Amino acid sequence: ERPTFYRQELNKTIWEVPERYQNLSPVGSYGSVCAAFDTKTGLRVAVKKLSRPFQSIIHAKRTYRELRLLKHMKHENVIGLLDVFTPARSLEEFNDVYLVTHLMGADLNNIVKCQKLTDDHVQFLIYQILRGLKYIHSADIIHRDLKPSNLAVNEDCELKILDFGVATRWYRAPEIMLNWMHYNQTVDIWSVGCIMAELLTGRTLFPGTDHIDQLKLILRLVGTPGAELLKKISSESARNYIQSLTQMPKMNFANVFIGANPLAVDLLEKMLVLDSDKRITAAQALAHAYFAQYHDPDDEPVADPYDQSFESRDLLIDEWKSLTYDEVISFVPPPLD
Ligand SMILES: Nc1ccc2c(NC3CC3)nc(-c3ccccc3)nc2c1
Ligand SMILES: OCc1cccc(Oc2ccccc2)c1
């Protein structure tokens, strides 16, 4: 049987959650989230109410996607699903979805408010991001939106990558700025690079005002593409644009990041490569000397394969809705261990 629910109202939204969750308290409003106490395990949790999960085909599919992703993630440094529930008793009345996950202290701008964050602290936080990224990437998933607010950190400096929930453009790979279609997983590595840079210096590495400015600032540090990179660019206007602007040489990263651990500077050089074919991967970055104290090859697991064939399907709202319902139904709680 499904358990006992109770209703209430928080800000502008109704909330119908199991009695198992208590002391709901808004924390930030894709949907709004409450901190709650979970009576069954004794932990504080985050409960997200999806906003009109089935508003359109695009919403319906997004809802399905997020549920499928969150159900698959089982790794210390990736946000995972504690619970998913609807008040609804049947598919006919299935209208709301709530997701339950660990409540973590802050996110990375908040958890890194001490501008000059320690080098040992950056090691451990970046290590953990890369460990989560290895796992995510191994499933053929690209995050695409890595940024400080997508990194949840508790008081112990333990980090989890959040799927969803300071401009996005600031952490965005330049191939994406340029609207390249066939980017790879290393767009996330670029973002880690920008994050690490910001943690080591206290400043946003590339605070572009828009996509043009963003590129300009990026090229300023890493240099304008060489002939090797240019010859891989399939768009004429893109090729002509970057070939048109003033040719910057790559800066010396040791000079730009003065006094930072030389190993951190070296990793940054490997992450912030303009050409994504030459960018370091998550797995490679974890073996980098900079993570000497943390890197353990037998405890950096990969994910079970992840079936995202659904992404190429065009279905009706009710079909996505029902697939989502099946996913809510078949959810097996993570073990109390
Ligand atoms: N193998 C590759 C490697 C890198 C690439 C890149 N990135 C460079 C920062 C500009 N950009 C583009 C591209 C293609 C079409 C339109 C706009 C951009 N392609 C790339 C192909
Ligand atoms: O520290 C902010 C935060 C931590 C953990 C979860 C969170 O939002 C959620 C909550 C449930 C599912 C997906 C994301 C936000």
Please report the domains of the chain, with CATH numbers, ordered by start residue.
Answer: 15-105 (3.30.200.20), 106-302 (1.10.510.10)
Of 163, 304, 318, 326, the active-site residue reads: 163
Give this entry's resolution in angstroms: 2.1
Pairwise CA distance, residues 65 & 44, whole Å? 25
Neighbours of 3 (CB within 10 A): 9
**Active-site residue flag, 163:** yes
Q: Is 274 in the pocket of ligand 1 (CB under 6 A)?
A: yes
CA of 253 relative to ligand 1 center, distance in Å: 23
Q: Indicate the top mutation candidate among 33, 110, 150 to test ligand 2's pocket, ranked by most ligand atoms within 8 A of CB.
A: 33
Which ligand is closest to the CA of 31, given by its number?
A: 2
Q: Looking at this protein, which amino acid is placed at residue 8? A: Q
CA of 248 relative to ligand 1 center, distance in Å: 18
Q: Is 254 in the pocket of ligand 1 (CB under 6 A)?
A: no
| Binding site feature residues for ATP | 27-33, 48
Pairwise CA distance, residues 34 & 296, whole Å? 35
Which experiment gave this structure? X-ray
Q: Looking at this protein, which amino acid is placed at residue 224? A: T
CA-nearest of 290, 284, 289, 279 to 190 is: 279
| Binding site feature residues | 27-33, 48
